[PDB]
Amino acid sequence: TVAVMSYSGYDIEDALVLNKASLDRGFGRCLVYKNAKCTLKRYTNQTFDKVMGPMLDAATRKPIWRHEILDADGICSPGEKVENKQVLVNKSMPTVTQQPQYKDVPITYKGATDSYIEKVMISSNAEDAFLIKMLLRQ
Amino acid sequence: IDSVAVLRGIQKVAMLVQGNWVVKSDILYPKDSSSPHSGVPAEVLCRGRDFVMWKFTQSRWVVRKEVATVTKLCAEDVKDFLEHMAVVRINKGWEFILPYD
């Protein structure tokens, strides 16, 4: 519903004034869906990437803050909110460049504002690679 | 054309109702067809059409508000099927599109 008038002086060059009690009731409400995918490949050497579980705090028996939203299979769970620099997939790759040694390469949520996880997709290609996609909602 | 013998062919594919021909049910949908529209899917039920065209044979028209409750199926089926043969007048259903020859 548009009234065409000169109001309040904040509408000089193409700027337009809105209604605060219309934005509260649902006008202009948008959703932004993003993506975060991670692959877990098998190498020519018989070694493979892996997802470790959440690393607990022994004094509190709760996970650490950077691993707060992870499920028991190392993958972030749908329904919970992510803040900045929390992990989503607890990946570990081999440094093959006798026992294999792993380094950590976690998929973390870079982003200035929070996001809710809606669904986590798990599928596999034909090359034994595991594909993991997350849908993120703001 | 052999315009006298051919009615034993035409009787199998069309039947005369209210002075005019009406397409028979088996031409449009055999009994395994999926819903042709969006919204909630529905299964085919040809007597759910044939009862409607039967009502046009006995009454003047289908004349009442809520036949979709009596026949249980979607309004989105009945009001879409009817829309290929008729035009709406206010409250009294649909109008038969061509005069009584």
């Binding site: 028991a72 299979d73 769970s77 986590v120 596999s124 | -």
Partner: protein
């Protein structure tokens, strides 16, 4: 205690535990989805 995933086509619990190719136990569909968590989340009604 085990993990439970949801099939993409038929919506059945699969419980993928060992290192197996990702495949539904009942259909042949090869995409899984995680379940919703059991922890609560708190929203503002704004």
């Amino acid at each position: 205690q085990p993990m439970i995933y949801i099939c993409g086509e038929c919506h059945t619990e699969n419980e993928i535990k060992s290192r197996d190719p990702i495949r539904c136990r009942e259909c042949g569909y090869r995409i899984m989805y995680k379940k919703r968590t059991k922890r609560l989340v708190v929203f503002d009604a704004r």
